[PDB]
């Protein structure tokens, strides 16, 4: 059992097991998550 | 090389903010562009205006349009007027001394709502971004920052120093506490946004988008959701336009100001049971803001300001049963210092008697020395103007095919040559003596007129293949330049119309021509965002100059040399030299499209009407891990032993700043440490700090919840520190250390056995579940 990106688009699931809904977040948290996913995509 | 800045500002009556009314009717505060206007109502004269210390376009000026005043509110008892600008700065003026004294900046966009309790000496501000801030004045700081909405804050209300209610451009209403300091209640009010909100002590009235207004009740009932807010009544059909501002009045009425040139005053005595539509008030302009005033409940007196520079007043006598009047009473109108519509042409006399004409035909004569009007005339949609020096007369070319002339001394209509052209006449120039007029008109026609002594008579017309935009006659009266609909500037000899020369290469229609005093340089401006300077001796392009991001609207020369001015739609006036071809100065006065430009005939002041009714007279003159652990150890354990000595007697700034008990402080820096440095950082410290570490660990074993929060980190550090300093620790002799180690051992063993028991129960039960299901449903 590995972990991957979760099934629902309303949730994000990182590789360390945590799961974050796209609704219970704050705006700056949404911003930093987008920035992290952006720099990961830019490296890939 | 000089420096010119502005010296006046006309037509600045009604900017984009809310009027604030003052009793003695009494005077009225409204917003000017980059300023605040105050005036009496029986007279209508500008009492005072409060601007900043730098005039725009100076040395200290910045390459950005200044933020306009978008909201303001004043306390008349304390006489403090707070003002909020478009960038999110909150200034505040006194009215007796007439100066700003302290400023704040916590927002990022325009400031929508401002309210302040001078009895609480605090100021609540909700801007176009999501945060509501509360500043305090005698503390001169932001006490906190309330933020749970997402779009803006459009409706806003406060109760004492205890409660708040706020609604936004996403239609949810949030009841906020102030003690518990958080959003508690939200209810989605309307489907779309929720513009307007007005709170009486029992009911609150909230309007949305399609005349849907709602009437709810407030209470301090202690349920989680009930009591504090209800969904009691819904009233509709006030208008078809969205409501914008609701305000209550009682000596039993309120009013709703919409966006369809209408306010509706209602009376309170299901929606038909409670409410009572008292009457309507209708104006001919799109209204902006309003405030009430009443005495003895026998009359209703409202102050209104529109989108256009009109300040209207309203009065209705009544008897608490009947509005008594089919229409209100406009006992005060203030227009004359404004233009009432967007200006389209400006001219300057040799006397420097300024001339401004606009969409009304409302030609207004101004002057520099008095900054007021002389007289106005009206002729319809007038486009271009001209000052005639002989007699100092004025001529207007319109969008209707008609050409008019007015006089500064006698009445308006001395002559009006109508049916002059089929389509609109766009530009108009005059020979330097004043004998021949020439007009360029959208019939592709260049009509030349003589000045008969008075009347005008077209001595000829010229027919072109393309539509016409601009026409300019030489100051030496040699050439006549026509900017067509295509990228074409045809230059004719004036004496015989010989089609002398042609200029091409703009890719867009040329919107302005100017030629030099000695008639060698022709400067041309199109919507192509670059100005083209040409030599007319050979029709050659001396230069091109990209500037003015939107479109260079108008270019004017100086009568002394080749130095010109360019004004655009993107609100920047650039002053260039035509021999060095570099912008000397870059003025950022106003913010809308700089429609009309006019340079002084001799002086150097320039006037520049914007779209927002702006007339501008420009006149010239780090530790390491181990170390940080060691010092945090010192601070925390010093606090711990001091507490212990104080407890036996009963028998830090960083601590009280971060608000952590010292055990949690030490555990926080242990969390902050990194493992790959934790090895060396634990090996470094001496045995005194080792003994201090064990005392801290015993304190955590007392404070069990932190232990079960961070069991593996604590155990790893403890086992490594005792394995490292094992020899000296067993060499020492300390009975208190013996008891400390005994307690630490018992509690660590108990906690680890507990979590081991949980893990074992879980793995046995799940193995049984898997075995039972496999023996059951596997074939």
């Amino acid at each position: 059992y590995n972990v991957g990106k979760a099934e629902k688009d309303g949730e994000i699931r990182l590789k360390n097991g945590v799961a974050m809904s796209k609704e219970e977040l704050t705006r700056e948290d949404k911003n930093r998550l987008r920035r992290a996913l952006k720099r990961k995509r830019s490296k890939a | 090389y000089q420096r010119f800045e502005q010296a006046a500002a006309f037509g600045v009556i009604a900017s984009n903010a809310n009027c604030v009314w003052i009793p003695a009717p009494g005077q009225l505060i409204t917003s000017a562009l980059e300023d605040v206007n105050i005036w009496d109502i029986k007279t209508g004269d500008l009492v005072s205006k409060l601007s900043d210390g730098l005039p725009p376009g100076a040395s200290d000026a910045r390459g950005a349009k200044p933020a306009e005043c978008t909201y303001l509110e004043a306390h008349k008892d304390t006489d403090l007027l707070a003002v909020g600008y478009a960038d999110g700065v909150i200034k505040v003026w006194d009215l007796m001394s007439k100066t700003v004294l302290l400023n704040f900046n916590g927002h990022k966009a325009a400031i929508t709502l401002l309210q302040f309790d001078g009895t609480g000496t605090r100021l609540i501000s909700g801007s176009k971004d999501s945060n509501i801030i509360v500043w305090d004045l005698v503390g001169e700081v932001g006490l906190y920052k309330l933020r749970s909405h997402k779009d803006s804050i459009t409706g806003f209300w406060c109760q004492g120093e205890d409660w708040l209610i706020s609604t936004s451009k996403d239609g949810m209403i949030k009841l906020w506490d102030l003690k518990t300091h958080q959003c508690i209640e939200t209810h989605i009010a309307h489907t779309g946004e929720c513009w307007g909100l007005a709170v009486k002590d029992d009911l609150l009235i909230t309007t949305g988008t399609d005349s849907q207004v709602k009437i709810w009740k407030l209470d301090i009932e202690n349920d989680k959701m009930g009591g504090k807010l209800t969904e009691m009544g819904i009233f509709e059909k006030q208008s078809k336009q969205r409501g914008l501002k609701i305000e209550f009045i009682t000596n039993s009425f309120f009013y709703i100001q919409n966006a369809d040139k209408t306010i509706e005053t209602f009376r309170i005595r299901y929606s038909s049971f409670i409410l009572h539509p008292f009457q309507t008030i209708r104006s001919l302009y799109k209204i902006k803001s309003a405030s009430w005033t009443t005495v003895s409940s026998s009359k209703l007196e409202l102050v209104l300001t529109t989108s256009s520079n009109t300040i209207e007043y309203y009065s209705i006598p009544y008897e608490k049963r009947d509005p008594t009047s089919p229409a209100p009473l406009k006992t005060h109108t203030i227009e004359l210092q404004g233009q009432r519509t967007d200006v389209r042409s400006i001219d300057i006399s040799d006397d420097n008697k300024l001339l401004a004409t606009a969409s009304n035909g409302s030609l207004k004569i101004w002057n520099i020395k008095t900054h007021k009007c002389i007289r106005t005339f009206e002729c319809g949609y007038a486009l271009t103007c001209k000052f005639l020096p002989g007699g100092l007369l004025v001529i207007l070319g319109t969008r209707n095919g008609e050409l008019q002339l007015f006089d500064l001394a006698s009445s308006s209509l001395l002559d009006t040559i109508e049916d002059a052209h089929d389509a609109a006449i766009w530009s108009l120039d005059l020979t330097s003596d004043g004998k021949r007029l020439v007009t360029g008109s959208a019939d592709k026609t260049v009509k030349f007129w003589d000045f008969k002594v008075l009347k005008l008579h077209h001595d000829t017309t010229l027919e072109l293949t393309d539509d016409i935009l601009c026409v300019r006659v030489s100051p030496d009266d040699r050439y006549l330049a026509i900017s067509l609909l295509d990228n074409t500037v045809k230059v004719f000899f004036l004496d015989s119309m010989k089609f002398y020369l042609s200029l091409y290469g703009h890719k867009l229609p040329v919107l302005s021509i100017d030629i030099s005093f000695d008639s060698k340089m022709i400067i041309t401006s199109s919507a192509d965002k670059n100005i083209k300077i040409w030599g007319l001796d050979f029709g050659d392009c001396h230069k091109s100059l990209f500037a003015h991001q939107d479109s260079i609207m108008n270019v004017k020369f100086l009568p002394q040399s080749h130095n010109f001015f360019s004004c655009s739609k993107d609100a920047v006036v650039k002053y260039w030299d035509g021999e060095k071809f570099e912008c000397i100065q870059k003025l950022y006065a106003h913010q809308s499209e700089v429609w009309a430009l006019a340079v002084a005939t001799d002086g150097g002041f320039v006037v520049s009407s914007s779209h927002d009714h702006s007339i501008r007279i420009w006149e010239e003159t780090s530790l390491k891990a181990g170390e940080r652990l060691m010092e945090a150890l010192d601070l925390g354990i010093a606090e711990i032993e001091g507490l212990e000595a104080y407890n036996r007697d009963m028998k830090n700034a960083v601590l009280i700043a971060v608000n952590k008990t010292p055990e949690q402080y030490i555990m926080d820096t242990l969390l902050r440490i990194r493992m790959s440095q934790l090895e060396d950082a634990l090996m470094v410290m001496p045995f005194s700090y080792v003994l201090k570490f064990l005392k801290f660990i015993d304190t955590v074993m007392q404070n069990k919840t932190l232990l079960h929060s961070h069991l593996p980190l604590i155990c790893k550090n403890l086992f490594f520190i005792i394995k490292f300093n094992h020899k000296e620790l067993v060499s020492q002799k300390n009975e208190e250390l013996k008891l400390q180690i005994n307690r630490v051992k018992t509690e660590l063993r108990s906690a680890l056995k507990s979590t081991e028991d949980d893990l074992g129960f879980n793995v046995q039960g799940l193995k049984f579940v898997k075995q039972q299901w496999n023996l059951r449903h596997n074939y």
């Binding site: 059992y1 972990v3 309303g10 949730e11 699931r13 360390n16 097991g17 945590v18 799961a19 974050m20 809904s21 609704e23 219970e24 | 949810m172 958080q182 959003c183 209640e185 939200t186 209810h187 989605i188 489907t191 989680k224 959701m225 069990k704 919840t705 079960h708 069991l711 155990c715 403890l718 086992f719 005792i722 394995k723 094992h726 620790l729 067993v730 002799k733 013996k738 180690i741 005994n742 630490v744 051992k745 660590l748 063993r749 680890l752 056995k753 979590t755 081991e756 949980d758 893990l759 129960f761 879980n762 793995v763 039960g765 799940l766 193995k767 579940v769 898997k770 039972q772 299901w773 059951r776």
Partner: protein
């Protein structure tokens, strides 16, 4: 009858309706099978009647009650979001857990369980009403909770909460139920080996607690 959404019958056997000013088909109705011949509208109750070559017929009618239901759904969701935020502020972690299970917010759920364990650190596994809620939970609620506990068990720092919740589930649910719940065996098989890993690691830490015991014994022997 609304005179905006013009309707079209169709010989494929179906109806498609569109806003007249749009130019794009709004909705698609596929009741009839083979063909479609007769199509009429009633105005006062805007009811579309349809007939095909077969002897089968149908009536159709728009409803704004779905719009009302969606507005009520959004209103309810926002209401209980605020109730959850207030409970996360003050306490009543049983109610906070109920709201979190309805709302599917695993971060706030994890924080609720962390606070519950920390305050239940003083049989009893949690707050007793929280235990009753876990006993009450639905089967789909159990599947969702066990998936989240599977991930929290994957992470080595959340395994304590994972094991406590799983032990509470086993103590307050039928093992017959947990065997007959579909798709749970994959979750349990995923859960088990990580639990064994954490078990061996905790055993090692107990051994080093006995190392502490040795240090005490030797110090007393010298003393």
């Amino acid at each position: 009858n609304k005179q905006k959404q013009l309707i079209s019958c169709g010989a494929d056997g179906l109806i498609k309706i569109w806003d007249c000013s749009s130019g794009e088909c709004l909705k698609t109705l596929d009741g009839h099978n083979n063909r479609l011949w007769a199509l009429s509208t009633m105005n006062d109750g805007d009811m579309i009647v349809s007939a095909d070559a077969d002897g089968v017929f149908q009536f159709w009618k728009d409803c704004e009650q779905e719009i009302e239901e969606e507005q009520e759904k959004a209103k309810l969701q926002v209401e209980q979001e605020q109730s959850l935020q207030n409970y996360m502020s003050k306490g009543d972690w049983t109610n906070a857990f109920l709201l979190a299970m309805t709302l599917d917010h695993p971060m706030r759920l994890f924080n609720v369980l962390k606070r519950a364990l920390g305050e239940s650190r003083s049989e009893v596994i949690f707050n007793e009403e929280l235990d009753q809620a876990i006993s009450i939970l639905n089967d789909e609620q159990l599947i969702l909770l066990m998936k989240r506990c599977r991930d929290w068990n994957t992470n080595a720092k959340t395994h304590t909460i994972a094991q406590r919740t799983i032990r509470c589930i086993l103590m307050h649910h039928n093992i017959a139920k947990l065997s007959e719940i579909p798709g749970m065996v994959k979750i349990v098989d995923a859960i088990i080996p990580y639990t064994q890993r954490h078990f061996t690691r905790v055993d090692n830490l107990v051994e080093q607690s006995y190392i502490l015991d040795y240090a005490l014994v030797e110090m007393d022997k010298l003393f």
